[PDB]
Amino acid sequence: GVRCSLLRLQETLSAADRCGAALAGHQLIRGLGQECVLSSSPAVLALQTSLVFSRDFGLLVFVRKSLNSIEFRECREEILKFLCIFLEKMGQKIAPYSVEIKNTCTSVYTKDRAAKCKIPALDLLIKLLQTFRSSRLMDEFKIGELFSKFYGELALKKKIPDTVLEKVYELLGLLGEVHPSEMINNAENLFRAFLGELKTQMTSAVREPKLPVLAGCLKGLSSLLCNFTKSMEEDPQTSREIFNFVLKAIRPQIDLKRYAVPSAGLRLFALHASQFSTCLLDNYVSLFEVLLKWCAHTNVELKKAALSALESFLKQVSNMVAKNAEMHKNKLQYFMEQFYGIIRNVDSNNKELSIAIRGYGLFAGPCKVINAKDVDFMYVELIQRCKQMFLTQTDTGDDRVYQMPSFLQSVASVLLYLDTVPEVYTPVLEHLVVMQIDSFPQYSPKMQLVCCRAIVKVFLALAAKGPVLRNCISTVVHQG
Amino acid sequence: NKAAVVLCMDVGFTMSNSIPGIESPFEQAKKVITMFVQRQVFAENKDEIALVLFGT
Amino acid sequence: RLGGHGPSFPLKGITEQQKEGLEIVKMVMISLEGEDGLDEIYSFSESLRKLCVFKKIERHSIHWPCRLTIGSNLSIRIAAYKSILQERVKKTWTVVDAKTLKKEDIQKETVYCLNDDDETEVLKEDIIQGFRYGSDIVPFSKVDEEQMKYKSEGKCFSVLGFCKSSQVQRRFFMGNQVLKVFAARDDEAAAVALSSLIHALDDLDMVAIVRYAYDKRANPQVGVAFPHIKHNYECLVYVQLPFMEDLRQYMFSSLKNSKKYAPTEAQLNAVDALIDSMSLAKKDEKTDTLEDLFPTTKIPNPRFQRLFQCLLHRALHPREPLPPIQQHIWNMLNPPAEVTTKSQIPLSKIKTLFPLIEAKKKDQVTAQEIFQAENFRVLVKQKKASFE
Amino acid sequence: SFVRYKEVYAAAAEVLGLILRYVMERKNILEESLCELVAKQLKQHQNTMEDKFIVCLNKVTKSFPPLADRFMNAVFFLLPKFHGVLKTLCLEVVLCRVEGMTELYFQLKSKDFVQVMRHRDD
Amino acid sequence: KYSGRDSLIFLVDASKAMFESQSEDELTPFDMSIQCIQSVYISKIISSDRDLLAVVFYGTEKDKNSVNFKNIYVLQELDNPGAKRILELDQFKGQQGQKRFQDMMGHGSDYSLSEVLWVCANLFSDVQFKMSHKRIMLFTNEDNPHGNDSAKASRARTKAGDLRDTGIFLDLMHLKKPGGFDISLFYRDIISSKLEDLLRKVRAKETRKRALSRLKLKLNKDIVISVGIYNLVQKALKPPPIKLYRETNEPVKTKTRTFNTSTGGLLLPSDTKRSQIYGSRQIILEKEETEELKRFDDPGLMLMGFKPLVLLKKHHYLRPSLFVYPEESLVIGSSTLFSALLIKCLEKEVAALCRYTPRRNIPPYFVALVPQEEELDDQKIQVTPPGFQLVFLPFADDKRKMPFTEKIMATPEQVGKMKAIVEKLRFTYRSDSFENPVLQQHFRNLEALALDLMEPEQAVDLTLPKVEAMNKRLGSLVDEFKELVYPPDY
DNA sequence: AATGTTCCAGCGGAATCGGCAGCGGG
DNA sequence: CCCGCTGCCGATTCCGCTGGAACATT
């Protein structure tokens, strides 16, 4: 089982009519992968880890020697897929075998012709550059000529079948993002490549779009914009155009079947809403509706990024109105009243009303500079609703446990932006964050993070306004 | 080796009579002469053109 | 409106002065030239429907000279003139550099990388061509096949025979052009020689299977030479014809011997009325000769005319996007209004009367089209937009 | 013979096999009558579409073994041509008839039986 | 069937007299069968170079097969025809060939029976392709192989029925006892002679059938019909010349690439425009601008009414005629009404004029669907299929202008003499058989450049007229035609 | 200086077909 | 909120055909 199947794999290389023997080797590779994945003991996991990668004989050297084999593709493809599985099956100690894998990845890409193996020879290499994002054990991967060749392999005939090209754009972006240190100079060429190709995809009265290419271009551009920001004040052309492309990639189609361009466009928007500063105040209404739409999409990963993009959008426009809210009276009123629309409307949703409350809390602070009274007009109806909902009524049996952290972050946010505390609800304030504590184990990850955000946020808010109410942080911690 | 075409175009008010219900004969003449000249100029031949205007 | 293969004046488009002007001009130009002048007259609608503005300006193709050889003795010097062949755009869309607009400021290349671990470049002079033969390749290279290739024995218009029963049917012409052989100059006896040949070939149903090569370099083609049938000249038209490898046999299931597709006589007469509604031919002026409604063999190519006007617009106006296709083009490429008006009804009679146009699950959308309490009661009593 | 949905042809075959077994156990003169019909319906399967042929033969032979004697040859010609579950159906079809095939060793060996016992499927 | 390759297993007898000259000084029938198989491979590897071929000899002392039955030697298993396999099969020609077969396999044995056909079955069985047709060519002279044993005859009969069950058709090509036919014998049940058809006249062809298009023909605006547009006449031409390395003999994968924006570097699709410089002015467009300006319609035919089959003359054609035929795929019921108006266009002698647009973004081009009735007989000669026939109509400058200034009349007496000349010159034109000189010579050259047989065959230029033959058939009269009106006379 | 052949790129039936979602299952 | 097939649905490949641009003889 261990190191003997690999031995048979290298033994069956020279057998004549390596077609049935090809299937036997492929089955052996499948069994090896199944065995290694089934392995649960970390000690034997590292043992087989060292076992598979050996210079004298192994699958790595097999791929390095089976290069000139047309029929050895499905076996090569199976080995590459197993390598992709392994690179995340185990930890971050691939190092002694990393660089050669990367090298062989390029080899198993730069010679193999079938796109069924050109994809894994990009999946494995993207995985390698993601799991060694740290500079250590990584400068052995020369980003220089890697970028050079994977950027020169798209200056040629319209050959590569729009899926390998998708992964190529993803990898160019990732090179822009992981290790941004050597490619300080050629990122302009990569930006111009991304914008030009995305242009051709979104402006043509010919040729129904290569949607995988559009998704790859957008996600790669997102990654490249990390560490290579173009804020919307220095060069006011490329940021306009990137945001225009993001709009068109998230413009609401009446009837589209595949959701891959909206996913990557929404993830770009979520990551980099701050990047598009002044472009993000013109059609904000339509952005609001489209973000609610894709929050209500009933997909699996389209909502996961639509909600993040909506959150970042509201966050950025809140941080924006909170600067010069003189001509932002109308926009402020619109946002807060649409949050009222989300929260007073009778909807059977869960993550819907958890948007209005958080937007309420974010937009609270910009209200202190328009009224200085609505920080108190709010935060009272907010605590009053908290008391009605999850202090007295259906305190035990209901579904209203999901939407407590939103209340708590909103409360803390308006709390910081509110001087001369009403000081009659503070007992209920502490009685509310204690009971946010009480219900932490009946939640899920990625709100447990946000619930911890709410708890530290309330703490850091009430604790920064003199010792009188910082005396209640002791009481709340004690009661929790 | 080369041929010369010398067109003539009437432009007068009667030629440019306001639309009797379909379209103007003068503008039809304009369309046809534009077809002729565009094909001649895009054929790169040495078939010269001399244009004159009457009813001016 | 623009051109419709039909009438010119809408209801009454003539006046007395216009009629007399037409009379005097036609009389003067007839006396100057003759009946050919009256033959050469058109409107602004068909001159946009025809190439009539382009006459006697372009030149004859080539008087390609060869000889009709029957056996080794019956020789007839001939000049073939090239007849129908597809025309094409004579300019290449030249690649340039973006935003600097210079043709020389770009240069492509071609590098023959090997199937090795990288782009292990090799030079041009160390690459010879192969050929597929089985599972491997044959190092044929170049000079070798330029020696042991077929040799053509020069340009040859030698007749391979004749045939009465026309197995040479139009569904087998295989060509890319049509040739038309008349005569030569220089004491035209060969004129009447081949004229005798074709006046023998025309009256009785025989054809002329012939061998033809353009020159020494060109490959030889066996074709059929149907005899010319016109009054002002008498030619021997020539057309290429398949070789044993060219023509394919495709078994298609029969229709007369088909059951589940059996058409009812109701359908037959329905499409009878459909055909007679949209017939493009008729008889008139008591001449017992058919007229040519929608004669698709005289109107120009919309391709290069639309290209001409598109490039005109983009050349004068470097900013505006591509224009739309003219209305007169779309009138070129549409049947006359009379047939459509006579047509709408049997069209719908078929629409209902025939089985359904069932399956429709296809879309070809372009990129630009896919990404571009008491207080409340007191208030109610006080104010109300509606009433009652 | 309705090859567009699984249950129509598969269950027609299975109920037909049940009917055939019943009219065999009842010694009546009707079994051969549509035994020939079902045989013919399989014969149109043998050489235009193989997977439906083996599915329907397995379904008839789950309850009626004595209809593969006149199909064993076919199944062997198809036995090394299947890799998925169709090979499992093929081998069950051969298994319903083995106790009486004259040698069956040569046909199996010719078809790589030893090498196919070594696969992973249970 | 499309992804379906037909196949041949060659079962060549070598027992007692097919091996031996048998008092005949022309060719031993074992060598005759070897020549036959050689011809088959030559024909296929260049006409049908995707099929499966196999040669197996039986009745031999040695025995190679998957199951190890005696006397059966599977020379080659089913695989694509190669130059190497025909070279390997070449070494059994002549007396030296007979002795080479002896020293490697060796004639003469208790030649086995049905087991032999058994091997053929397995050779078909143990392949992983899709076989449209399966057949076994059986080259033998022994035609009464059971004057002594009756059990083996019955076992052979059972196994032959066993083989015809699974779609395997025996068709034995026929060696001879005297050299020609005298053996009128009785294996008519085992089978479902003239090997000369199978030795020479398969020199070069190609095999396929495919649709070239699946378009809609639209009548008014919404009653669209599902038509396919095949071509029955192609102009096949010499295969592509792959580039090989001079030393390693490998197909280098060339890569083209543009650069040098005055900085060298590397240009990218969007870094370039397209231009034309007419007269003294350049015009600049985007790639998509040019690709779009040649857009008029979605693919498919639009009916433009009907016209008689007397107005479209025959001196107008532009392209090889296509052939449309209804497939009931895009819209159902297409075949029914398609046949309906085909019958109507027949009886009315009318044809469906249309505006063809074959591909997505292509200029329109006027076409005419000339109706076409099929043809068949008791012999089932599918000479023509039933449907329409897309004749492409020239537009306006396709039609060139000839001088037309030729007017000299003729003498209607010698015209009959020329008539008689062409009446003795006539013969059946053809339905087939005009092998392409250049292509045939090319295939010869590839053969005798990968078969090593240093003399390349000489393609007989069938196209070249036999001028001397028809001159001696003519007689000495055309000289009188020359002297009649145009004597040399200085 | 025109024309036919060679060459290259781009679009398409057709076959696989993997897998993208979507209706059953616990 | 999960798990299993079961279509049908995009892309892939590999032929194949056409168009367009190159390229060598007179």
From Swiss-Prot, chain B:
ADP-ribosylated by PARP3. Coiled coil: none annotated. Induction: In osteoblasts, by FGF2. It is found in: Nucleus; Nucleus, Nucleolus; Chromosome. Individuals with systemic lupus erythematosus (SLE) and related disorders produce extremely large amounts of autoantibodies to XRCC6 and XRCC5. Single-stranded DNA-dependent ATP-dependent helicase that plays a key role in DNA non-homologous end joining (NHEJ) by recruiting DNA-PK to DNA. Required for double-strand break repair and V(D)J recombination. Also has a role in chromosome translocation. The DNA helicase II complex binds preferentially to fork-like ends of double-stranded DNA in a cell cycle-dependent manner. It works in the 3'-5' direction. During NHEJ, the XRCC5-XRRC6 dimer performs the recognition step: it recognizes and binds to the broken ends of the DNA and protects them from further resection. Belongs to the ku80 family. The EEXXXDDL motif is required for the interaction with catalytic subunit PRKDC and its recruitment to sites of DNA damage. Heterodimer composed of XRCC5/Ku80 and XRCC6/Ku70; heterodimerization stabilizes XRCC5 protein. Component of the core long-range non-homologous end joining (NHEJ) complex (also named DNA-PK complex) composed of PRKDC, LIG4, XRCC4, XRCC6/Ku70, XRCC5/Ku86 and NHEJ1/XLF. Additional component of the NHEJ complex includes PAXX. Following autophosphorylation, PRKDC dissociates from DNA, leading to formation of the short-range NHEJ complex, composed of LIG4, XRCC4, XRCC6/Ku70, XRCC5/Ku86 and NHEJ1/XLF. (Microbial infection) Interacts with human T-cell leukemia virus 1/HTLV-1 protein HBZ. This is X-ray repair cross-complementing protein 5. It comes from Homo sapiens.
From Swiss-Prot, chain D:
Autophosphorylated at two clusters, the T2609 cluster and the S2056 cluster. Autophosphorylation induces a conformational change that leads to remodeling of the DNA-PK complex, requisite for efficient end processing and DNA repair. Serine/threonine-protein kinase that acts as a molecular sensor for DNA damage. Involved in DNA non-homologous end joining (NHEJ) required for double-strand break (DSB) repair and V(D)J recombination. Must be bound to DNA to express its catalytic properties. Promotes processing of hairpin DNA structures in V(D)J recombination by activation of the hairpin endonuclease artemis (DCLRE1C). Recruited by XRCC5 and XRCC6 to DNA ends and is required to (1) protect and align broken ends of DNA, thereby preventing their degradation, (2) and sequester the DSB for repair by NHEJ. The chain holds residues 2308 to 2429 of 4128 of the full protein. It comes from Homo sapiens (Human). This is DNA-dependent protein kinase catalytic subunit. Belongs to the PI3/PI4-kinase family. It is found in: Nucleus; Nucleus, Nucleolus; Cytoplasm, Cytosol. DNA-PK is a heterotrimer of PRKDC and the Ku dimer (composed of XRCC6/Ku70 and XRCC5/Ku86). Formation of this complex may be promoted by interaction with ILF3. Component of the core long-range non-homologous end joining (NHEJ) complex (also named DNA-PK complex) composed of PRKDC, LIG4, XRCC4, XRCC6/Ku70, XRCC5/Ku86 and NHEJ1/XLF. Additional component of the NHEJ complex includes PAXX. Following autophosphorylation, PRKDC dissociates from DNA. Interacts with DNA-PKcs-interacting protein (KIP) with the region upstream the kinase domain. It comes from the Eukaryota.
Swiss-Prot record, chain E:
Its main location: nucleus. It comes from the Eukaryota. GO terms for molecular function: 5'-deoxyribose-5-phosphate lyase activity; ATP binding; ATP hydrolysis activity; ATP-dependent activity, acting on DNA; cyclin binding; damaged DNA binding; DNA binding; DNA helicase activity. It is found in: Nucleus; Chromosome; Cytoplasm. Keywords: Acetylation, Activator, ADP-ribosylation, ATP-binding, Chromosome, Cytoplasm, DNA damage, DNA recombination, DNA repair, DNA-binding, Helicase, Host-virus interaction, Hydrolase, Immunity, Innate immunity, Isopeptide bond, Lyase, Methylation, Multifunctional enzyme, Nucleotide-binding, Nucleus, Phosphoprotein, Systemic lupus erythematosus, Transcription, Transcription regulation, Ubl conjugation. One of its GO terms (biological process) is negative regulation of DNA-templated transcription. Phosphorylation by PRKDC may enhance helicase activity. Phosphorylation of Ser-21 does not affect DNA repair. The keyword Mitochondrion does not apply. GO terms for cellular component: chromosome, telomeric region; cytosol; DNA-dependent protein kinase complex; DNA-dependent protein kinase-DNA ligase 4 complex; extracellular region; ficolin-1-rich granule lumen; Ku70:Ku80 complex; membrane. The modification Phosphoserine is found at residues 21, 262, 433, 476. Residues 217-424 form the Ku domain. Residues 233-297 are annotated as: DNA-binding. The keyword rRNA-binding does not apply. Induction: In osteoblasts, by FGF2. Its EC number is 3.6.4.-, 4.2.99.-. The active site is at 1 (schiff-base intermediate with dna). Individuals with systemic lupus erythematosus (SLE) and related disorders produce extremely large amounts of autoantibodies to XRCC5 and XRCC6. Existence of a major autoantigenic epitope or epitopes on the C-terminal 190 amino acids of XRCC6 containing the leucine repeat. The majority of autoantibodies to XRCC6 in most sera from patients with SLE seem to be reactive with this region. Belongs to the ku70 family. This is X-ray repair cross-complementing protein 6. It comes from Homo sapiens.
